[PDB]
Copies of this chain bind each other. A is one copy, B any other.
Amino acid sequence: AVQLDTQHMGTDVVIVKNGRRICGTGGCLASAPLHQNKSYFEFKIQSTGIWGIGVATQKVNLNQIPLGRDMHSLVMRNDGALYHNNEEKNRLPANSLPQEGDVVGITYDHVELNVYLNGKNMHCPASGIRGTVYPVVYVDDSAILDCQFSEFYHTPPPGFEKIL
């Protein structure tokens, strides 16, 4: 099963619940790369705080909070802003700020990353990044995120499938 990879996690990251839950401080890559045209994955915001979700290469520093500060990661942060190379690429409108209990869906097709909130397209795309990319997640400040790589709360957006 695709899960949070304990071989690729930050120093103070805790992975529990069969590779599904991240807490502590830092980031983790998923156990498989986005080696397909169209990928969908989800995180449930069990406890909010500082967190973000997106894609990264194996060059990413998994102690970097927040991610998106350099070329190695593209993430939606907990404030809804999408960052890569320390540049704001897009932002969810304030009316759609992610809240505790939300499911955040990510699509990635190598051309763009898009965000879905509880099954709804936010239409806030950011251009894809260079290199071999993996799902990435980070937490701090008491955030707890749970991954769904196969058994989704939301039907994958059409054309997108679970990571193989």
Q: What number of copies of this chain does the assembly contain?
A: 2
Question: Are B17 and A151 touching (Cβ within 8 A)?
Answer: no
Residue of B with least CB distance to A20: B153
- CB-CB nearest in chain B for A103: B17
Give complex CA distance A148, B148 in Å: 10
Interface of A is mostly: loop
Decide if B153 touches A150 in the complex (CB within 8 Å): no
Candidates B18, B149, B150, B153; contact of A155 at CB < 8 Å? B18
A103: chain B residues at CB < 8 Å are: 17
Say whether A1 faces chain B, with CB atoms less than 8 Å apart.
yes
Chain B positions within 8 Å of A17 at CB level: 103, 153-154
Q: In the complex, given contacts A17-B103, A20-B153, what are 14 additional A-B residue pairs having Cβ atoms less than 8 angstroms apart?
A: A1-B151, A17-B153, A17-B154, A18-B152, A18-B153, A18-B154, A18-B155, A20-B151, A146-B153, A148-B151, A149-B151, A150-B150, A150-B151, A151-B151
